[PDB]
Amino acid sequence: VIKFRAGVCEYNEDSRLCTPIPVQGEIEIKPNEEEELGFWDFEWRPTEKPVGRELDPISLILIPGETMWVPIKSSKSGRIFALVFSSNERYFFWLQEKNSGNLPLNELSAKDKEIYNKMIGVLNNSS
Numbered sequence: 001v002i003k004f005r006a007g008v009c010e011y012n013e014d015s016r017l018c019t020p021i022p023v024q025g026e027i028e029i030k031p032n033e034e035e036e037l038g039f040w041d042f043e044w045r046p047t048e049k050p051v052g053r054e055l056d057p058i059s060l061i062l063i064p065g066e067t068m069w070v071p072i073k074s075s076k077s078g079r080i081f082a083l084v085f086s087s088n089e090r091y092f093f094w095l096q097e098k099n100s101g102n103l104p105l106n107e108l109s110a111k112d113k114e115i116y117n118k119m120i121g122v123l124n125n126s127s
Helices: 113-124
Strands: 002-004 007-009 025-030 040-046 058-062 067-070 082-085 092-094
Touching (some): 067 113
Antiparallel strands (some): 002 025, 007 092, 067 082
């Protein structure tokens, strides 16, 4: 399975912005070796607690065509994961590493092309 490092970023999208407040965590991108619902679970874990928000651990199904991928929604901020979630909870993430994701802000999430390709592949799959 594919593991990636990020903490959370606020629930907020009432101005299409959420601010980084530093935190850590871990996402596990997996097909689910139980396949109960038959979708991708992003298992978030706190490794630092959310401060200035409370978002609990979550096993998060991405349901194609209900989950929309936008690669960046902030220009006063960098490294924002933007997933519009309908029929599910909304979790926005911010990469915990200030040394990486220094690639320019036009697609920035943690990288440009890699995250963009990867996130489109989850929509294409229903696995």
